[PDB]
């Protein structure tokens, strides 16, 4: 019969996306911030979220914040090369000392713009998973996930110390301005199990909530 085709396609045209495992990898790709210009980003893929494998956690060279990014889907992302990357292990100087910062409150020194001494209380959550001489750390009055070489910090005296599940679950946040923002819980902290990571659809930050 001689009709107009309508949702025409073909099964051949239909390749998988996110085939190759890029965990551990070093990546460059482009970034089109709105109508803005196409800058290049380089970084290191730390994890791939088990309960949403569209989602990668990237550490970008010289951004302190960990980024959750849906690397294949996201259309601000272009030209995604996986660099080959080295036979440089970087092992850890003192792992008795590193293994007793997991879990601890800490006080972390930051310069202000004038070069004056600011200290921010945080918590150290875990050692980062690919670059395992960095730590996941979150802060009390910035509760998103950050990454630093907290030994280097301790070493130069810039850091001090003192004494089932719902992973998968979609969640929304109740703004006092009426709207909602939908995300999902993506990780549970092995050290402080009352602590989880949320990732909201409209933002690349991983947020750390204590949910008990």
């Amino acid at each position: 019969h001689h009709h107009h085709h309508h949702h025409h396609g073909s099964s051949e045209n239909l390749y998988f996306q996110g085939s190759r495992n890029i965990v551990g990898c070093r990546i460059q790709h482009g970034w089109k911030e709105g109508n803005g210009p196409v800058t290049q980003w380089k970084g290191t893929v730390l994890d791939q979220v088990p309960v949403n494998p569209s989602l990668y956690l990237i550490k970008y060279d010289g951004f302190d914040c960990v980024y959750g990014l849906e690397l294949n889907k996201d259309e601000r992302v272009s030209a995604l090369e996986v660099l080959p990357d080295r036979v440089a292990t970087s092992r850890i100087s003192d792992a008795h000392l590193a293994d007793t910062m997991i879990g601890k409150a800490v006080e972390h020194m930051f310069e202000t713009e004038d070069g004056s001494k600011d200290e921010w209380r945080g918590m150290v959550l875990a050692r980062a998973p690919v670059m395992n001489t960095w730590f996941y750390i979150t802060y009390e009055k910035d509760p998103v996930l950050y990454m630093y070489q907290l030994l280097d910090d301790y070493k130069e005296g810039d850091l001090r110390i003192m004494p089932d599940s719902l992973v998968g679950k979609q969640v929304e946040y109740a703004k006092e301005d009426g709207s909602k923002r939908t995300g999902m819980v993506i990780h549970q902290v092995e050290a402080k199990p009352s602590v989880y990571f949320i990732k909201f659809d409209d933002d690349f930050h991983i947020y750390v909530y204590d949910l008990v």
Partner: peptide, 5 residues
Amino acid sequence: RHRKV
């Protein structure tokens, strides 16, 4: 010696 953004 860390700058806040």
